[PDB]
Amino acid sequence: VGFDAVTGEFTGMPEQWARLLQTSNITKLEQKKNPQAVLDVLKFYDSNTVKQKYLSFTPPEKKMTDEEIMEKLRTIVSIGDPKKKYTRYEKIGQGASGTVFTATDVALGQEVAIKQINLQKQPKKELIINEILVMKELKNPNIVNFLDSYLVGDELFVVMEYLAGGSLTDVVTETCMDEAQIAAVCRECLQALEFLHANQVIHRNIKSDNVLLGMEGSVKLTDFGFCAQITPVGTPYWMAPEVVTRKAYGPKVDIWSLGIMAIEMVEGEPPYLNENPLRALYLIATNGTPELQNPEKLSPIFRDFLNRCLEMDVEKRGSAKELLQHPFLKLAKPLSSLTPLIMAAKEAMKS
Amino acid sequence: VGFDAVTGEFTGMPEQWARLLQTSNITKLEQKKNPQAVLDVLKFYDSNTVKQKYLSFTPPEKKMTDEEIMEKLRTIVSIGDPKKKYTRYEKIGQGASGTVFTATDVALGQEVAIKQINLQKQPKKELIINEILVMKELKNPNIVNFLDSYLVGDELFVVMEYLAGGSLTDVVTETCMDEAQIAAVCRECLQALEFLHANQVIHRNIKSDNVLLGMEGSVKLTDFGFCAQITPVGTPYWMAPEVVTRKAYGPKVDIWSLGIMAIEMVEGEPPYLNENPLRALYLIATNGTPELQNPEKLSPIFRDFLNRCLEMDVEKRGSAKELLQHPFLKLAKPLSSLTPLIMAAKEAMKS
């Protein structure tokens, strides 16, 4: 509850938070200069709910029987064998979100992601089916869209779009993107965010891992809902200061995350790489922006874009509609300019 | 068209029927004494359509989209894995009626038959689904009833009741049924036929192969519709003279077939066993009843029942409601009396 400034002791802290603080590698001086922030990040880290989101309501606003399931599945389920329509199956994930596969549609030659939900075992069947119903009308080229679904016993196969160019992470870790490429990627991600925000969705997880690239440079976001959670513990480097403050927050957390990602595209790794997670949260809460590797190397107009994304004041932080008009995006190359970086990244994996 | 009595030549016969008649092993004298019958059986044998029946209209009277299929399947499909709910799968048939399996329900311990229909490849999807919808309300203990269905991709699994005692054929070929056992089986088959007839269904295939026995002597018919076609070319020994005449026919063909089956239960084999099929049809058309092995061995009251089933006049042939009241059925033993015959038959198969 309270803090004594000269001793440096918090008064009346819960069992867990006293325990966490000792492991935090936050200094007594740091506790002194920002006592409120420390309590905020201790509370945040203690919460640690997986906090799964589901899109709801197909129209503009956005204990179950076999017959009610078959009612809901009327407009989503195709009569087809997913073992004949798709090949090159590879398992890429398993957990509470279903098992997940990549595969290739035999007829079109296009890669897809297939999520497999056990309707009998899975809790909140109604939410998942409701999300698919949303996803059928919630269509945009910069997201992974719902393609198809199949009922295989008690197992619902949800097929989403996918791309064969890898993640943006692979490109930034293995190559050096110039600013005109970074502008191109930022523009595509802002187009996606503008669409998501227009439809009352906050993504919440904008990071290069959730940015999927096609071979000709097409860009799509993933991990915004349940169904699009098709990519597979540590520091949440991408989170805005309001979130880790445990304040109420809005769509401009995605803008913060986009700024963090633009820094990742320059430095070739995420920030806070070797930090204690609690210290990292503390640093996000007090400092916001992690200090740059070598900031003279960037152009002023990119530094401007980075500032407008990484403003700590939510009112001063830019909207997606606003940043779409920012001069940095005018430096943007054709998306095909990414093709050599993607191929280089693919042949550099060597694993 | 015509016949010249002294030469013994039919005039103006089609290509096929002149061809068939030479292979028929019907005599010139036999052609003479019954010229009309010969033409009737030649026409009948030339027709040879598989002539699949489907029950239609669930209420008292009795180019398709994925969404229309999922509409129709609303009340029939369970959300479950048929590979986990049933074990001891054995494939017992394949063809135009789907692939067919026996299996055992894990939870209940009861044997079932599972028919597997490819919805994408199968013609007349609507008829099959309509039949299942009938089968859900068309319930009787002396038929195999619809239990459950599952959608597995484009494959619809239809689960029907089954029994582990084998067919009536196995019991008659390997054991000697006394008349009180035969009365018991006839009563059960007439109870089934009375129900089928009451619901405007003619079975059309009453033979011991389609009579399924349980271990404690329970009796059920199969092969009346599409779904109940769960048992797997030669002589149609069981057919009434009206059918092979190619006249119009009614439900009392099932009564003829029941009489033929009661003879099979005595002689231990079907009639016409080594005949030419065309001669067999000729003999059914002219003589009706095949001549008995040793008729003094049967009781007069059984011979009476056999006469009322195997009357060639449809008006004199008995109805199922009528034969249920016939004195022969009063000789009927408890169905458990079949249990030793079934076990004997099962251990006699040795294959």
Reduced to 3 states (helix: H, G, I; strand: E, B; else coil), residue A158 is strand
Rounded Cα distance, B295 and B284, in Å: 19
User: According to the annotation, is B98 in a ligand binding site?
Assistant: yes
- Tell the residue number behind the tokens 């945009």, with chain if given: A140
Rounded Cα distance, A11 and A3, in Å: 6
Asked whether the beta carbons of A349 and A342 are under 8 A apart, the reply is: no
State CA A26 to chain mean position distance: 27
Q: Which of A18, A46, A42 is nearest to A9 (CA)?
A: A18
User: According to the annotation, is B235 in a ligand binding site?
Assistant: no
Closest-CA residue of A relative to B70 is A74
Reduced to 3 states (helix: H, G, I; strand: E, B; else coil), residue A2 is strand
* Residue in B187, B204, B279, B317 annotated catalytic: B204
- Tell the residue number behind the tokens 């000789």, with chain if given: B331
Cβ neighbours around B104 below 10 Å, total: 17
Pairing of strands A146-152, A155-161: antiparallel
Asked whether the beta carbons of A71 and B74 are under 8 A apart, the reply is: yes
Q: Which of B142, B119, B289 is nearest to A150 (CA)?
A: B119
CB contact under 8 A, B79 and A150: no
Q: Please give the single-letter amino acid code of residue B258.
A: L
Concatenate the DSSP letters of all residues of A123-150 into one string.
Answer: S-HHHHHHHHHHHTT---TTBPPEEEEE
State CA B153 to chain mean position distance: 32
Name the interface residues of B facing A (CB cutoff 8 Å): 66-67, 69-71, 73-75, 77-83, 119-120, 150-155
Rounded Cα distance, B248 and B231, in Å: 27
Cβ neighbours around A27 below 10 Å, total: 12
Residue B301 has, within 13 A of its CA and on its CB side, a CA count of 13
Sorted by where each starts, the structural domains of chain A and their CATH numbers stand as 2-47 (3.90.810.10), 66-161 (3.30.200.20), 168-348 (1.10.510.10)
Reduced 3-state DSSP string for chain B: CEEECCCCEEECCCHHHHHHHHHCCCCHHHHHHCHHHHHHHHHHHHHCCCCCCCCCCCCCCCCCCHHHHHHHCCCCCCCCCHHHHEEEEEEEECCCCCEEEEEEECCCCCEEEEEEEECCCCCCHHHHHHHHHHHCCCCCCCECCEEEEEEECCEEEEEEECCCCCEHHHHHHHCCCCHHHHHHHHHHHHHHHHHHHHCCCCCCCCCHHHEEECCCCCEEECCCCCCCCCCCCCCCCCCCHHHHHCCCCCCCHHHHHHHHHHHHHHHCCCCCCCCCHHHHHHHHHHHCCCCCCCHHHCCHHHHHHHHHHCCCCCCCCCCHHHHCCCHHHHHCCCHHHHHHHHHHHHHHCCC
Backbone angles phi, psi at B221, to 5 degrees: -85, 155
When CB atoms are compared, the residue of A70, A150, A153 closest to B82 is A153
Asked whether the beta carbons of A280 and A235 are under 8 A apart, the reply is: yes
For testing contact with chain A, the best of B69, B79, B132, B159 (most A CBs within 10 A): B79
B74 CB-near residues (< 8 Å, 6+ apart): A67, A70, A71, A74
CA distances from A176 to A184, A273, A346 (A): 14, 19, 14
Rounded Cα distance, B313 and B311, in Å: 5
DSSP β-bridge partners for residue A86: A105
d(CA B61, nearest CA chain A) in Å: 25
When CB atoms are compared, the residue of A69, A79, A80 closest to B79 is A69
User: What's the reported resolution, in angstroms, to a tenth?
Assistant: 2.6
d(CA A148, nearest CA chain B) in Å: 12
d(CA B89, nearest CA chain A) in Å: 17
Reduced to 3 states (helix: H, G, I; strand: E, B; else coil), residue A103 is strand
CB contact under 8 A, B79 and A119: yes
Q: Which two tokens stand for residue B137?
A: 């309300």
Run of H or E residues at A30 = helix A28-33
Asked whether the beta carbons of A262 and A167 are under 8 A apart, the reply is: no
Query: Beta strands of chain A (E only): which ranges?
Result: 2-4, 9-11, 86-93, 99-105, 111-118, 146-152, 155-161, 211-213, 219-221
Q: Is the dihedral of CA A129, A134, A137, A143 positive or negative?
A: negative
CB contact under 8 A, A80 and B153: yes
Q: Which two tokens stand for residue A261?
A: 């990602």
Backbone angles phi, psi at B26, to 5 degrees: -80, 135
Q: Please give the single-letter amino acid code of residue A263.
A: I
The alpha carbons of chain B give a radius of gyration, in whole angstroms, of 22
Length of chain A: 351
Q: Which two tokens stand for residue B216?
A: 């404690």
User: According to the annotation, is B250 in a ligand binding site?
Assistant: no
Rounded Cα distance, B124 and B129, in Å: 9
Q: Which of B228, B179, B182, B174 is nearest to B201 (CA)?
A: B228
CB contact under 8 A, A119 and B155: no
d(CA A136, nearest CA chain B) in Å: 15
Reduced to 3 states (helix: H, G, I; strand: E, B; else coil), residue A206 is coil
CB contact under 8 A, B70 and A73: yes
Q: Which of A308, A310, A258 is nearest to A142 (CA)?
A: A258
**Which DSSP state fits A157?**
E
A22 CB-near residues (< 8 Å, 6+ apart): none
User: According to the annotation, is A100 in a ligand binding site?
Assistant: yes
User: According to the annotation, is A337 in a ligand binding site?
Assistant: no
Length of chain B: 351
B298 CB-near residues (< 8 Å, 6+ apart): B179, B266, B292, B306
Gap sites in chain A (C to N > 2.5 Å), preceding residue numbers: 62, 232
Rounded Cα distance, B197 and B194, in Å: 5
When CB atoms are compared, the residue of B73, B74, B80 closest to A153 is B80
